[PDB]
Design a protein around this ligand. Structure first.
Ligand SMILES: NC(=O)c1cccc2c1OCCO2
Length: 108
């Protein structure tokens, strides 16, 4: 079911967005926030871009959704020091994300 997958991913994405550790990932990283970010991170991703992708019916599979959200975390951990707040946020939100995927029974 297409609309089943859509509904589930939308619920999950909205919960991830409302979480208090999501704030670093809500929109594209701004050049002024991180000058030369876009020279280091070749595949940028953020939750706004994911919202649009979802609305645009891009997430036809679990795999695609997971790949994008994971990219958000791996960009963060590649760019930032391990004890930075942004790195801490990524691991907290990743935990939350996995509980939500499991809670949904969302399998591939
Ligand atoms: N998310 C990041 O890795 C990030 C890295 C550097 C600056 C930032 C960032 O997120 C939005 C706020 O400004």
């Amino acid at each position: 079911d297409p609309d089943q997958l859509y509904s589930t991913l939308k619920s999950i994405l909205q919960q991830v967005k409302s979480h208090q550790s999501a704030w670093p990932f809500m929109e594209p990283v701004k050049r002024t926030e991180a000058p030369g970010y876009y020279e280091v991170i070749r595949f940028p991703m953020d939750l706004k871009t994911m919202s649009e992708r979802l609305k645009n019916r891009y997430y036809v599979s679990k795999k695609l959704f997971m790949a994008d959200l994971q990219r958000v975390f791996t960009n963060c951990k590649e760019y930032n020091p391990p004890e930075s707040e942004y790195y801490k946020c990524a691991n907290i939100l990743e935990k939350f994300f996995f509980s939500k995927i499991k809670e949904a029974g969302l399998i591939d």
